[PDB]
Symmetry: none
Subunit: 311 residues, 2 copies
């Protein structure tokens, strides 16, 4: 059997701040052209979908792919890691915990660069495990004073849990109230219609639209995209095909000319925010660079800990 | 964790004849539209390539992807196999031996359909792993009396091993003499340019061009394509994009109108050979249907033997 890195191993091996460092470096490599990704490709027959994506990151000594089935809208994932030094397979890796940490770490990287530095109100659409991870990681990055939550399944107990975890009081709020009050809005839903009116967004707001990989899902309306100074994506290529919202946006939004790549933001090449008033949208799809980079870092850390071979 | 199938397990679990039966059935399914494939996709950075391809084959209860690195022409292959019934990951599978077996098995299916039935002279370009496996499986399928081999780098021992494995006298021969004398020609090299003059090919010949899957390399020349009655491919979408033997063809060759898919040949829909004198070319690049189908067969067979869960 190949070495298998499971979710519990990832939970202990990868801190949010390590995840942010690893992803920052991998994106800088991607921007310099010293790392490469495979776009997400989907195949389907008999109601069973198979998808693949991946990356080659020689700067971190790894290459890999994430492969997964989709059946009735449910996913089962395997990440497979190889050595970039000699090409040999290294390990398989669960995707659940890794994806939770990765999604919030990328949102933090983007908000750190593009949200107002003194942001103090976080709005959350969806307060399950991904929403809560975003709240924890963002609370560590910003001096937050409130977390406003919209999720019909949040309970007073979930709110106290998240509040205690973050050290910031969390409370329920209506969608229009979140949009109007929040400096940073994260949307983490399988919605197929817009979560709030673009008109309602606070001046200066950063929106991290995480949403879903599933067909027909979208969270933002044309107005939000039209209002935005910039729409930050992981990769020009994939994110402009993949995402429901970006593909749908009519020529009116001017979306095209305002799309900027995360690597350019992180490298300090984009100058995306011109003014305090600017709205910035970050659209996350998950690209193969991110999974591979974090699984490689986990492999390296667990190997050192356990006497596994170096990548 | 995951169950793993290694190269030694495939060597023992998978005969050529079984591989041919499994692959013939998978192609029929693909031909009927009930199975689907992912084209090969290649990603490269810092001299390290990562490739993926795969398939969903509900009829055989499996889906999966082969993922491999290439570093200086050297490959490391792993198949990730999933259940088409419930989507769950079933196994990792080393795929060195699998790849070797499936490529030769598919060429034997094509030759069985398209070469002269009483073919007795095999011409082989390339006496390495791939060429030798083709010679072995063809020696079982046809009543061969001679194997004529050209490989500019091979030692006398390699040739002696081929003769012994095949139970057929094997000798070194000049490319022009091979082309002139062979009933079946297999090209299994990394040559970037044609190996012999297409004008030299014997009337009636079946030519299995296996070595090239880069759009800038070709093993056959334009005259070969012109002379050929039919050029049979595994899947038009992939082959016509990848195979330099086809990409670089002059319009002169009439290639467009003579391309036929392997599934239509195996289903008895194609009638590709119109005359004994006809030359027929099979251009192979390797496609994900073959990998998935053979990995599923191996899994099922080993699972029955070892008590592993059913797909
Ligand atoms: Cl790609
Ligand atoms: Cl500020
Ligand atoms: Cl959206
Ligand atoms: Cl910026
Ligand atoms: Cl298909
Ligand atoms: Cl005959
Ligand atoms: Cl292959």
């Amino acid at each position: 059997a190949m070495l298998h890195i499971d979710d519990a191993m990832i939970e202990d091996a990868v801190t949010p701040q390590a995840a942010q460092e690893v992803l920052h470096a991998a994106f800088l490599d991607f921007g310099r052209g010293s790392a490469a990704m495979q776009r997400r490709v989907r195949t389907e027959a008999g109601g069973v979908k198979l998808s693949t994506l991946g990356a080659v990151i020689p700067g971190q000594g790894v290459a890999g792919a994430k492969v997964y089935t989709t059946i009735k809208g449910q996913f089962q994932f395997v990440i497979l890691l190889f050595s970039a030094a000699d090409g040999r397979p290294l390990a398989t890796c669960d995707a659940g915990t890794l994806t939770r940490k990765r999604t919030a770490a990328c949102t933090v990287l983007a908000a750190g660069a593009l949200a107002r530095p003194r942001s103090s109100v976080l709005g959350l659409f969806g307060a399950g495990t991904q929403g809560a991870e975003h709240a924890a990681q963002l609370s560590a990055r910003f001096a937050l004073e409130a977390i406003l939550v919209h999720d019909p399944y949040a309970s007073p107990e979930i709110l106290e849990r998240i509040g205690r975890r973050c050290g910031v009081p969390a409370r329920m709020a209506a969608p229009a109230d979140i949009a109007a009050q929040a400096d940073i809005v994260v949307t983490a839903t399988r919605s197929t219609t817009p979560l709030f009116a673009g008109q309602a967004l606070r001046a200066g707001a950063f929106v991290g639209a995480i949403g879903s990989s599933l067909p027909h899902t979208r969270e933002l309306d044309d107005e939000a995209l039209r209002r935005a100074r910039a729409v930050v994506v992981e990769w020009r290529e994939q994110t402009l095909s993949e995402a429901g919202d970006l593909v749908l946006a009519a020529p009116d939004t001017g979306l095209d000319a305002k799309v900027v790549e995360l690597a350019d933001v992180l490298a300090g090449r984009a100058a995306a925010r011109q003014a305090d008033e600017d709205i910035v949208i970050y659209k996350s799809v998950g690209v193969g660079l991110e999974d591979v980079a974090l699984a490689g870092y986990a492999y390296r850390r667990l190997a050192a800990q356990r006497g596994w071979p170096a990548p």
